[PDB]
Amino acid sequence: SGGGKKPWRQKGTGRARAGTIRSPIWRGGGTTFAAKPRSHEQKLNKKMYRAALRSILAELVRLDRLVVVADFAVDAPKTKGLVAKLDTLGLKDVLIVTDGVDENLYLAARNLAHVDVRDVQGSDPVSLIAYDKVLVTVSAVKKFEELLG
Amino acid sequence: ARVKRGVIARRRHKKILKLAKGYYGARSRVFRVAKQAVIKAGQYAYRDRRQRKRQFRALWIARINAGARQNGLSYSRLIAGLKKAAIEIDRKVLADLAVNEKAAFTAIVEKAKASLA
RNA sequence: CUUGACUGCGAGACAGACACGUCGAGCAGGUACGAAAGUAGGUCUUAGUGAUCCGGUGGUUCUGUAUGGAAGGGCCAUCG
RNA sequence: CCUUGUCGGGUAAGUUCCGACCUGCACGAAUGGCGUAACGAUGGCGGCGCUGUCUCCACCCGAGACUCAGUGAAAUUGAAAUCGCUGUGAAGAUGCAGUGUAUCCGCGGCUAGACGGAAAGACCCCGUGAACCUUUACUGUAGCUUUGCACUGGACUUUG
RNA sequence: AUUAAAAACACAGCACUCUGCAAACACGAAAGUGGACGUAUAGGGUGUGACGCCUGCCCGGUGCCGGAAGGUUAAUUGAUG
RNA sequence: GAUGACGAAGUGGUUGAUGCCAUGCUUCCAAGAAAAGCUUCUAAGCUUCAGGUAACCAGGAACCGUACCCCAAACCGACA
RNA sequence: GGGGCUCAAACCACACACCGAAGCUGCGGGUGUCACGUAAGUGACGCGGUAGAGGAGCGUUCUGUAAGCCUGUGAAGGUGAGUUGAGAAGCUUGCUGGAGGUAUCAGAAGUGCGAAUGCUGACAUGAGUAACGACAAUGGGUGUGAAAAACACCCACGCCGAAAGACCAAGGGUUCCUGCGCAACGUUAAUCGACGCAGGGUUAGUCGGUUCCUAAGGCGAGGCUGAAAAGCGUAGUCGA
RNA sequence: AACCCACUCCCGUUGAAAAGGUAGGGGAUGACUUGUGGAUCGGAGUGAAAGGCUAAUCAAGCUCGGAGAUAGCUGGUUCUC
RNA sequence: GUCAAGUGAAGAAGCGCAUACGGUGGAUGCCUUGGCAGUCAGAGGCGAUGAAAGACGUGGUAGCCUGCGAAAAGCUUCGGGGAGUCGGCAAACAGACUUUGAUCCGGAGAUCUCUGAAUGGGGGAACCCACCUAGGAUAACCUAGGUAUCUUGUACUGAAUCCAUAGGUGCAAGAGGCGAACCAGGGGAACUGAAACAUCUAAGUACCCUGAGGAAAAGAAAUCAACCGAGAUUCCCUUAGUAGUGGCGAGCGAACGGGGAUUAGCCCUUAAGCUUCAUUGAUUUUAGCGGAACGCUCUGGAAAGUGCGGCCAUAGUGGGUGAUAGCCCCGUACGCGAAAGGAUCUUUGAAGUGAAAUCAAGUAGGACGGAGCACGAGAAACUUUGUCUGAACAUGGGGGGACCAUCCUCCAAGGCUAAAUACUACUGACUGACCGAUAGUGAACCAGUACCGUGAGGGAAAGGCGAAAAGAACCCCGGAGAGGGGAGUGAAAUAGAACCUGAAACCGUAUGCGUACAAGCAGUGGGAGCCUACUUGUUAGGUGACUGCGUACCUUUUGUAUAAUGGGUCAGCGACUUAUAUUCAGUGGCAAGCUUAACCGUAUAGGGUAGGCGUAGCGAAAGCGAGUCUUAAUAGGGCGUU
């Protein structure tokens, strides 16, 4: 705000040369390459996305980090029930990938601290690499072969 | 990500001011003068790792000159006679024997006079 | 006596920052002279000059804002 | 301009002054020419008085300076353990070389140097900088003016 | 105003020139207003600067004023090719 | 020293303004504010009681500013 | 260059020896390139540098890793010490501090300061120097006080007196008065103050204003005019 | 004399003062000086004219915008090998 | 013993260096009641029923904020809440109020001083003076209403002037002003670029002005296309930096055709729609209610942390609680909830409006002078019009980029229309590889303040004790001071109010060593001596006599110690960014193909291949094509072709 006038005349004052109070050298003044709201979203190709997916499912296989179950279904919307269902599998810090997220399976584990429930479309490279184990159903493995090739 | 540069500027100025301690006045306590004094000390120290090897050689040569003239020989005649012979012995230990072990230096100047140079 | 002060080009060089510039055997088409080999793409040689954009003029196979034409534009030759 | 032209006067001595001369570089008649009493905080010369202007300054009186008590700035400043001379050198040196001098620190003074301090030189140059003034620069425009067409009609006469 | 008080400006007086009134002229896209509730002895512009004696020659340039009417000449006309 | 009561003389002559008479008088050109209050006249009306004019009696005069500085330390000069 | 130099410490020759550089060599490290090498692995030639090109890194803040790990048995910061690297820098610790910090590997930058007569704060030097604001002028006594050249009172001296006196307008806005005070303000000190705190003080028919009236000028119903905004103006009604 | 002015010297120049002081000087019944209120304003006022003045600013005020004008110019540009 | 000569250790007015403690000073770290930027919603105005913005009053203490308005930190009612309260800086203190339900919160009322469009008349804003009607009041007033201007409508009245017109009086209704932006118009620069500059650009931008609305504007073909067709308008991605346009310079820049977001056309033989009412159900909003599950132990001032064992979960990375908490509190997920208002949508009536009358004449067209269309009047179409003119009438008329025929396509001179679109001063929630006190707003704090200006206008600086004031009873020096020395509080007071940490500049005191015969960038190589710690030695730290070499740094230059520039110093800050197009390198994915843009999307996925580039070139082009262009040439030559 402000900064219209020259602060002083340019000669005679014996002082350095300013054209505004709000110059970026000054402490009232502006910042020199002041930010404006930008976007950081970049282009990943569709094939490059799908090919980065096909090589982390491969590493989830090789590192024994992927766990396939026939079906994963909870009965009631209770976090204790889903803790008990994962504790049979010996399984904390897991990404559960089902073919379509049920509301019972979503209401449980949306409080649970290290568990995430996603569908196949809604899975991403960061959540595949992040969780210490990845649980997929057989229908999810069908859906990954449909999507990724 | 605004990053406030006052914590690293301080440690870099402490390093320069620590390298400048012992100096006169503002050479040891204000940064824009201590910095120049530290750089200048570094140039002189580079130059004087060379002139150390120049100055000690001249002192050895002057002491060998003084020791050889007590035995009736110059420096230059002594260095010539120690190569008509073969001594391979340097100005450092000859100056050390000139001060400390005077009978051994007398033996060395007699074996230079023995080669008649 | 006569038009080679030709038309299409052009191997290859010289010069050269670029735009320019310089020389040119040979090939085709037509011609001068010469009985004929041959010479002839101006002048013994190097100065005598001026970019582009605008306009003018003569052609043209081209384009031609629905279509047939024109208008205007394009290319080729030329003038200020 | 030559030029302090020449001649006269004034002075011991006068590039100034006054009176002439006319060879007017380059006066001249309302961008007026010549005179002109009175009037100028007007320009230039000379005189009487008058005197510290001066020879040439002496003394005295207050106010600062100096010391003491209290309060308490400034411009400037790369850091300083901050001499002379002669050289040398971006060509005028406290700092370089050689060589002389020089115990350490104030206070009062004086300003010869620190190319001293103050103002990104005003002169000069330069900028395909600017501003403002001029005109017979270029290009325009306000205003003034000419004609046509409107608003704008009928009636006669001269006339193509 | 704050480095120039003068020989500069002003001035009475003088002359030129414009202006007939809804004035010339000025400020105003205009309405209006000043000139002026004045009216040529008035009002504007310009130059000179009390007074005394005077104020010479030139109308080519440029301006201003008047004059025929010949050439040129704009919009507009729209014959002819 | 603060206060209550008592409290002497308190007159005459001269000189006198830049004050007053005086918004007068004389003179000169440069020819010297408006409007109201005030005095007076009628109009439109009144019924010509209202209104006016004197006397007498009783009553009233709102609001606002007032301290302090003004040849200044209080205003205007950044300052006692 | 100086001291000084005369069968020279000068000059002309010739000889032999020596000194002299970051030059060469020796010895120990690091680095570039090239060739070899089952990639230990050596060799050889290099390695001054401004503008500039190219290559490889350090550190700061944020995000992910991270609901992790560290940390009140003590974080970040600050201040020493030691130590390790070619460097930017790292690591360990004594004291201070008293609540946060971020291995690693990646992502992102308000990413690194000595200069711009750079900005803003603190503080220097000049320097306890110049000044302390008209050269009307002060001297005692007494009191009060913690302390009086400066306050108050007394005695005396000066100064103004067409003002340095009294007053009105404007402008200011409590500065006025009285108690209590003296940090700061007062160019010194202050017990004093136009300063701080708290109280009080301004009384109108007649003095000024409002109210009544108008001048310059303003505004102006309607109205004329103007792209709009507006301009000018009649009735009017403000304006000393 | 007041008042208004500002010719001379000296001081002052970090001033007591961003234009003064002290000595002297000019006008001082007028083309005078001054209070209070009002009018004229930025290619625009007013000017007895000097480029004077228009709020310590003037060959085109101040302020805010166009605006971070433009600068073939000057200055600066921050860790390491 | 003496006398000579030689030799020289202490004795510092003051300085220097190191070290240790201080002081100043506020950096740094950490923190936040403040900002900044988005997303999703809201509702898009307030005002003559008096606004925005104020002045003055209003309290037991009474200054300033914040509320209120002479009924003045409040009054009356409904509704919620259920234990404290009498707003804040500002902690205390009085007098009190509350379970017979205060305070507090929401809805509706009541009051609402003066200013300000300010509106009874004036006026220098917050002041001055009025009139009329009604009622009440004893030579004084008081209550409640009115009293502006304009426009429109209406009534009465009526000048010159006969009639009736102007005009005038009274009624009704409406307006005016303010607000950051968005929108439609009127008027409209200059710097700048063109490496000068005039055309041109910047730019129909900035600015000024006028209207309107929650959006506006535009909109239902006298529109485009080429003989095929599409059908209103707006917005977005492309076609494309292409065609054009341009001192053919700087530059400016389409359309056809696609892909989408959106979805509607009704009428002038009277309609959709939109308003305003009354209703019909329904939804939201303005307040709230409930809302799970932890103990023991160690260190500690304090436990949330350590060690162990649990529990809850449609609630686990929220805030703060004496250190880090799902289970301590407020909350959160999740359900419930409204006397009364408001808002949106929906019925089904009603009055209006739309609405200009009846398919468009001073109109189309044209001549001059302009303006726009990307288009600098140009071959210049099409639009608009300042001046002047001026038609046909469905066997008409205008468009298809000069113009003319032929076709194709529409019906101008009357209208009204939702959505997609823009914007955000203002609210609410949520979010951030946003800032964290020189930053972020100018403004974290009583900031548009203080201050500066005559004004317009400019415009600051200033955050942090502690968990809790437990904010230091009492004693002593001192002036019933200031400031300290103790004692207490506290984990800590070198956390003591100027208070977290507490750097550097700068200023001191103490100790060690060196400094008074020595000449200069103040160091560096050598180096004696002395002093401390160690434990001693071929060490570590501190001084550094003496001595060789040695003219700072920057910037600019052919060159600087330069007597050239720049810097007093310190600490903070302060300079290659970002967007969009593109080229090259590196690195990946797919590969004769690759890739999507808007947009759709339970949304970083998937879809969408419109478009872009590549697979073929040559030519100015028609065109022709592994060829093509030039050419009289199957010749030459240019460019191209696993």
| Domain locations in chain B as residue ranges | 1-117
> Can you tell me the distance from the alpha carbon of A65 to that of B3, in angstroms, rounded to the nearest whole number?
40
**Rounded distance in angstroms from the CA atom of residue B38 to the C1' atom of nucleotide I147:** 94
**Rounded distance in angstroms from the CA atom of residue A133 to the C1' atom of nucleotide I494:** 56
Query: Tokens 């301690």 belong to which residue?
Result: B21
- Which residues are CB-neighbours of A14 under 8 A, at least 6 positions away? none
Looking at the DSSP assignment, which residues form a beta bridge with residue A136?
A68, A97
Method used experimentally: cryo-EM
> Can you tell me the distance from the alpha carbon of B107 to that of A138, in angstroms, rounded to the nearest whole number?
101
Looking at the DSSP assignment, which residues form a beta bridge with residue A134?
A66, A95
**Rounded distance in angstroms from the CA atom of residue A28 to the C1' atom of nucleotide I91:** 39
A9 touches strand D (CB under 7 A): no
A2 touches strand H (CB under 7 A): yes
Resolution of this entry in Å?
2.8
Q: CB under 8 Å, gap of 24 or more: what pairs does A78-87 form? A: A78/A108, A79/A108, A79/A109, A79/A111, A79/A112, A81/A108, A82/A108, A82/A109, A82/A112, A82/A115, A83/A112, A86/A115
* Nucleotide nearest A33 (Cα, C1'): I577
Nearest CA to A94 out of A137, A38, A37, A45 is that of: A137
A57, A120 contact by CB (below 8 A):
no
> Can you tell me the distance from the alpha carbon of A148 to that of A125, in angstroms, rounded to the nearest whole number?
13
